[PDB]
Ligand binder design. Structure first.
Ligand code: SF4
Ligand code: SF4
Ligand code: FES
Ligand SMILES: [Mg+2]
Ligand SMILES: [Zn+2]
Lengths: 125, 96, 115, 86, 48, 208, 690
């Protein structure tokens, strides 16, 4: 009832993607960096897969922004790095993986503001 | 406050005009170029500055709920006048 | 391990048998399709197109992928024989309105930034 | 026929590069004293066999593996490359 | 509008116009923004 | 709870929980999980092998007799090893109740067709095959139902682009409609709307 | 160990002593609301938005400031804490102006988002609001102080990070205002960061004003090239146009900040750009032409001449891919004269050993040091984030700083040893007491700037600094892998060029003038037509029209750092890669693609065809160029030290004077910054202030 065939998964021939949008693309798998304008960290929880930026030009009428690559807006979400890597490999996309950046824990001390001899003593508050 | 480009086209309030070598001007031949003749910057520059004997004044653009969100403007700086960020009206304290 | 449920074929041999059956069906159908749709292509180049479409997937070594491709090709043949397709659908395999894309490095460098 | 530059790619902690490392620590300076105008670029591999590249005139390059070589072996390889004899 | 007239505004058209499609007075769309990238102008004097 | 909050119904919650436990007890071979939502909806997560039995049971058991198939669809979750989840919504007129049955599959594993249990499934599975590429075994006639003839791919997959890969126009040289790679005069504007500062603490995940 | 047990919503978690309630909640994955608390700043505790209930405690505590106690059960979502959050948000919004449609911080406001998530949905404030007058602090930060919520983040950042104490609060109670109390510009190389830390639209970017909304922007994660720090950045674009530059967090390099030049010099990317190939006509003027014409014209001269008659110069913004492509192309001609504008001494080891030209201690290692000696450099303007790290260590670790050179303002107090380079020898001999100070140090650091190497005594200065470091190692012993010796670079392309085997300096060109010269982004003016033979064929490849383009015979338009995926190595030796945010304008192309096409036209075709193959070539030449976050390496200080004792060049009696003496010298350094109007406005503001 089981084949037990040994080969890496490959579904490129079944997805209908054109040839030049498989081998020429370079996906990036990363945890998005926090927007520095805000302190909330809820946007840095999941992994993202996104494609490489292609040409954008000006529409001769209306001066709008025109594109020719169909994957310009494609972003996928993943729970772990391994899941995204597996998806990319089974879809035949060359990928670059960036390790997650976590802000290291810090030593905070309110009393250090009023130091007797150290430089941590603040001049205003 | 519509001006005229050296080529002959009317310069819009955003300041746009095709340069002399621009082929896109061909779109206006046998037709016209849509330009609004009422320039908002000139029109708001014509409003007189209101004289108020208060340190802080509120502006909603007029008309009550038909205006813009009500904002409060400080008039401590005597060198300039307070300007509404929505409407462009100017307010000033009675110096001297 | 790596045990998976089959679709139609247990090993590659049954998959190739199904592929050959589908290829025979397409080869038989090509002349009738050429005549029925009043195509300006020849039977020879239609069969060349069938051969090229089959050869596009020649690198598959997974029987499940193979018989899924066979299922899709059989669906395509069903659409062609029953005249559910129009002339435009059949002629889409040939890309007659697309200007050719050069492959060499210099031409791609000249036309733009796209590799 | 003229040698242009030499590159030695060695790994920092791998056992296979150990002898190569010793080479430098013992005698790289002496080699540089004998070849003051020859660039011998020392760079670091990772999870990869040690290598020696030699570049000759008009961009010709040859590379020889230095995996598990002792210090004397890499010294002999460098002397062979430098003297021109194969 | 005879019994109660609309509010008068300086910017309101004093002369109403009809649909001017298929007419030299028709509207023609165009971009209203300025150049984004300015090209370098080479010098006019020969270098040597 | 004040007038702006949806009222709760504990009686239906208890009834649905009891019937879920009952179903799980009767078919332990296939039922992997049973859940009841806070708005009183019962779902049963089963192994793919049990599609025909469980559905048959839910259609034919005297205490269940869910005789109506309201909807059958799929959901694409790329992060899962089994990519697609197959959802059956069933309605029982005898007991005025609704149930949901969930299973899973990947790109290559077929799912048993349920046309023998419900005739209504015939088109639904076809639509799934068209939109997600899930193959149904022993379907009477499986083929595309929604896309154009010769369309490549399955649009409802997450990785399928919104505008697709080809577009259609009329060419006068060949005097017919032709398909060419997509080119937008104005590209679709991608908006990043998700805010930081999470909204619902009750759904917070462990930080692992 | 010493970990104590606390509870967050009944969940046990082990924390170090001194951990606050906020960090304890962080460890479980719950983010406490905040307005005044910042990780990188001192604790303030004034906004009271972090108030949370401790179980069996009648009073809510400020999570950002209160250390957690053993056995405490923090109730993050209890009714008391939610009511406290609602009350605090109501108070914060009572006097806030209804400016959201016209405020630049619309979709990026922590006030807006925290009001939506933790505040109420209506107001019961029936009074009039207060309005304060705006302040002018320069052309970079736009100020609308009616929106200010008095969190004092800007004051704390200016005092602690930037080292500038000009910001403060005046008045009392409801009319207390944040400002300077006098008309004064807050001008420092780190001044723009107060825009990021400000949670509201009180402080905004002035050049960015009214241009875009946050939900429109596409974010490209990339690397700065305005200096050699290699600070991680986010390029925010929209509809194919670069809209702004934001800092990207990297603890080891730039932490959370970027320099003002890095933030605001992107304006120059839209000006004086090279968009088409150009050649010389019969009149000797530059005229547009096709890629084929210019490339064939260059290839003809490339085939005509060979060997020593061909030369190339690399600028400060050149990536590794183009550098290796140019090196291969010139090697196929049998030309080895591949030079950089920056000078590094070639005597002894030279570029043979990588550690000879790196910041071996690394930027993070500054936090482990106890004494640092700076030689002939101004870290404040050459590497502003490195100077910020030094300031942070000085503030938190009581780091001792000494400088040899002109007494520039470094935003922290230091010991000025003097101006004469001879002092270095006096330190190496041992008569100077600073030799004893270095001897007693456990983690001593010596940093020599490349600007000091730009003078004719670079070899002797490097030898003296090496002697100082060698004496330190011989006396104090080997504490381990500390790597005392350090070199601080100023341009982004220097380390990659030295890794690839480029010759530092341009003295090879002066010794043997070429007949065909490649200017790969060379805009330093080191080599002119006067130093060259008559009818020298000059090729300029780059992205900006600057000092290098008008003297060229052929102009090849290239890509800027925002328009390619390219490799740059910072002063630490860490390799990083940018990403494409927008494509090059007009007919401009990727640089290594230009070089590969030229090689094909000239018949000396290079093996690589794609970016992956060029990076494989880079791995072949220098394998550390493909490790994209690694900063570890082997130390070869001993060999380089003995090799530096061969030559005995003498020092001149010229005081060490860095090129950047004041802030006005910091804004305009490269071709991108020289084409920026924002930097011109900054220069005008600092030179004369209103
Ligand atoms: S700072 Fe925030 S809340 Fe205040 S006006 Fe601006 S966007 Fe609105
Ligand atoms: S200006 Fe901004 S950062 Fe400074 S105190 Fe006011 S709200 Fe805080
Ligand atoms: S965040 Fe703690 S009081 Fe402001
Ligand atoms: Mg702000
Ligand atoms: Zn108003």
């Amino acid at each position: 009832q089981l084949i037990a065939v040994d080969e890496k998964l490959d579904i490129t021939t079944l997805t209908g993607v054109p040839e030049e949008h498989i081998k020429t693309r370079k996906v990036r798998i990363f945890v998005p960096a926090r927007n520095n304008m805000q302190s909330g960290v809820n946007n840095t929880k999941k992994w993202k897969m996104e494609f490489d930026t292609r040409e954008r030009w000006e529409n001769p009428l209306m001066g709008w922004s025109s594109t020719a690559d169909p994957l310009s807006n494609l972003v996928l979400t993943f729970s772990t790095k391994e899941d995204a890597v597996a998806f990319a490999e089974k879809n035949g996309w060359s990928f670059d993986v960036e390790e997650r950046k976590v802000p290291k824990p810090k030593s905070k001390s309110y009393g250090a503001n009023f130091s007797w001899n150290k430089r941590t003593r603040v001049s205003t508050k | 406050g519509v001006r005229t480009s050296p080529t002959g086209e009317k310069v819009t309030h955003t300041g746009q005009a095709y340069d002399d070598g621009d082929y896109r001007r061909v779109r206006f031949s046998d037709r016209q170029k849509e330009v609004n003749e009422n320039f908002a910057i000139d029109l708001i520059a014509e409003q007189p500055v209101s004289e108020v004997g208060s340190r802080v004044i509120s502006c909603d653009g007029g008309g009550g709920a038909l205006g813009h969100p009500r904002v409060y403007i400080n008039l401590d700086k005597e060198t300039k006048t307070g300007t509404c960020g929505y409407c462009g009206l100017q307010f000033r304290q009675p110096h001297h | 391990g790596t045990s998976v449920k089959p679709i139609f074929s247990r090993d590659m041999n049954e998959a190739k048998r199904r592929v050959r059956e589908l290829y025979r069906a397409w080869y038989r159908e090509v002349p009738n399709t050429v005549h029925l749709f009043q195509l300006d292509i020849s039977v020879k180049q239609g069969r060349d197109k069938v051969r090229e479409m089959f050869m596009k997937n020649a690198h598959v070594t997974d029987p499940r992928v193979v018989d899924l491709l066979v299922i899709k090709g059989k669906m395509e043949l069903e659409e062609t024989i029953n005249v559910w397709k129009q002339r435009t659908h059949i002629m889409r395999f040939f890309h007659e309105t697309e200007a050719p894309r050069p492959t060499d490095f210099l031409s791609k460098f000249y036309v733009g930034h796209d590799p | 026929l003229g040698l242009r530059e030499i590159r030695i790619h060695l790994c920092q902690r791998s056992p296979g590069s150990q002898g190569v490392r010793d080479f430098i620590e013992k005698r790289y300076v002496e080699l540089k004293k004998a070849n003051p105008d020859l660039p011998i670029l020392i760079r670091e591999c990772s999870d990869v066999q040690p290598k020696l590249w030699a570049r000759y005139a008009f961009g010709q390059e040859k590379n020889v593996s230095l995996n598990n070589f002792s210090a004397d072996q890499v010294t002999r390889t460098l002397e062979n490359v430098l003297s021109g004899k194969a | 509008p005879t019994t109660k007239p609309p509010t008068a505004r300086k910017y309101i058209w004093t002369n109403h116009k009809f649909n001017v499609s298929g007419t030299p007075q028709q509207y023609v769309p165009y971009s209203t923004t300025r150049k984004k990238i300015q090209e370098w102008v080479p010098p006019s004097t020969p270098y040597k | 709870t004040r007038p702006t909050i949806r009222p709760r119904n504990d009686v239906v919650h208890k009834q649905l929980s009891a019937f879920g436990q009952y179903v799980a007890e009767i078919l332990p071979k296939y039922v992997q999980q049973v859940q009841v939502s806070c708005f009183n909806e019962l779902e049963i997560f089963i192994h793919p092998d049990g599609v025909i039995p469980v559905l048959t049971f839910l259609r034919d058991h005297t205490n269940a007799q869910f005789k109506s198939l309201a909807d059958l669809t799929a959901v694409d979750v790329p992060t899962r090893q089994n990519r697609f989840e197959i959802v059956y919504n069933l309605l029982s007129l005898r007991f005025n109740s609704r149930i949901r049955v969930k299973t899973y599959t990947d790109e290559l594993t077929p799912i048993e067709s349920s046309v023998t249990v419900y005739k209504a499934a015939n088109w639904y599975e076809r639509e799934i095959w068209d939109m997600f590429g899930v193959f149904f075994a022993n379907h009477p006639d499986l083929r595309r139902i929604l896309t154009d003839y010769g369309f490549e791919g399955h649009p409802f997959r997450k990785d399928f682009p919104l505008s697709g890969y080809v577009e259609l126009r009329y060419d006068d040289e060949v005097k017919r409609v032709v398909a060419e790679p997509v080119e937008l005069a104005q590209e679709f504007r991608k908006f990043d709307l998700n805010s930081p500062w999470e909204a619902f603490p009750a759904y917070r995940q462990p930080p692992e | 160990s010493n970990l104590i047990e606390v509870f967050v919503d009944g969940q046990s978690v082990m924390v170090e002593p001194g951990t606050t309630v906020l960090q304890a909640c962080e460890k479980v994955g719950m983010q406490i609301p905040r307005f005044c608390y910042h990780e990188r700043l001192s604790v303030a505790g004034n906004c009271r938005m972090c108030l949370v209930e401790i179980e069996k405690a009648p009073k809510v505590v400020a999570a950002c400031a209160m250390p957690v106690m053993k056995g405490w059960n923090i109730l993050t979502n209890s009714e008391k804490s939610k009511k406290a959050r609602e009350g605090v948000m109501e108070f914060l919004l009572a006097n806030h102006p209804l400016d959201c449609p016209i405020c630049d911080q619309g979709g990026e406001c922590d006030l807006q988002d925290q009001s939506m998530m933790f505040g109420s949905d209506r107001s019961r404030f029936l009074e009039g609001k207060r309005a304060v007058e705006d302040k002018n602090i320069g052309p970079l930060v736009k100020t609308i102080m009616t929106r200010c919520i008095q969190c004092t983040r800007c004051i704390r950042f200016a005092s602690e990070i930037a080292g500038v104490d000009d910001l403060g609060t005046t008045g009392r109670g409801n009319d207390m205002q944040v400002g300077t109390y006098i008309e004064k510009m807050f001008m420092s190389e780190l001044s723009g960061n107060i825009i990021d830390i400000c949670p509201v639209g009180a402080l905004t970017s002035k050049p960015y004003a009214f241009t875009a909304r946050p939900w429109e922007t596409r974010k490209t994660e990339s690397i700065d090239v305005m200096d050699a720090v290699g600070s991680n950045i986010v390029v925010s674009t929209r509809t194919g146009e670069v809209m702004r530059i934001l800092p990207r967090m990297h603890e080891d390099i730039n932490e959370e900040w970027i320099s003002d030049k890095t933030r605001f010099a992107y304006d120059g990317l839209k000006r004086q750009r090279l968009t088409q190939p150009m050649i010389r006509n019969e009149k000797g003027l530059l005229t547009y032409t096709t890629w084929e014409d210019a490339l064939s014209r260059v290839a003809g001269m490339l085939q005509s001449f060979q060997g020593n008659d061909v030369a190339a110069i690399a600028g400060g913004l050149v990536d590794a891919e183009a550098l290796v492509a140019l090196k291969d192309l010139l090697n196929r001609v049998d030309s080895d004269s591949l030079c950089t504008e920056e000078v590094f001494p070639t005597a002894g080891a030279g570029t043979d050993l990588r550690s000879n030209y790196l910041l071996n201690t690394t930027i993070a290692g500054v936090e482990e040091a106890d004494v640092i000696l700076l030689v002939g450099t101004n870290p404040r303007f050459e590497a502003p984030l490195f100077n910020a790290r030094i300031r942070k260590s000085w503030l938190h670790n009581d780091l001792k700083v000494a400088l040899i050179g002109s007494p520039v303002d470094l935003t922290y107090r230091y010991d000025h040893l003097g101006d004469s380079p001879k002092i270095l020898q006096d330190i190496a001999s041992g008569n100077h007491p600073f030799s004893q100070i270095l001897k007693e140090a456990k983690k001593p650091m010596v940093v020599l700037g490349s600007s000091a190497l730009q003078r004719s005594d670079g070899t002797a200065i490097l030898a003296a600094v090496s002697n100082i470091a060698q004496n330190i190692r011989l006396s104090s012993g080997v504490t381990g892998d500390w790597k005392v010796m350090n070199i601080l670079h100023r341009i982004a392309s220097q380390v990659a060029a030295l890794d690839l085997g480029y010759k530092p300096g341009v003295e090879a060109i002066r010794k043997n003038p070429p007949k065909v010269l490649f200017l790969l982004g060379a805009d330093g003016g080191c080599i002119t037509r006067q130093d060259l033979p008559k009818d020298c064929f000059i090729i300029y490849q780059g992205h900006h029209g600057d000092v290098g383009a008008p003297m060229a015979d052929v102009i090849l338009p290239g890509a800027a750092y925002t328009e390619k995926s390219a490799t740059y190595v910072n002063t630490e030796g860490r390799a990083q890669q940018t990403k494409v945010a927008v494509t090059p304008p007009g007919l401009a192309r990727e640089d290594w693609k230009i070089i590969r096409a030229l090689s094909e036209i000239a018949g000396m075709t290079l093996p690589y065809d794609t970016l992956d193959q060029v990076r494989s070539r880079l791995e072949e030449v220098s394998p550390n160029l493909v490790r994209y976050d690694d900063v570890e390496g082997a130390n070869y200080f001993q060999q380089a030290n003995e090799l530096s004792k061969l030559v005995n060049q003498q020092l001149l009696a010229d005081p060490l004077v860095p090129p950047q003496l004041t802030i006005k010298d910091f804004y305009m350094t490269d071709s991108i910054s020289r084409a920026s109007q924002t930097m011109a406005k900054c220069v005008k503001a600092v030179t004369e202030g209103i």
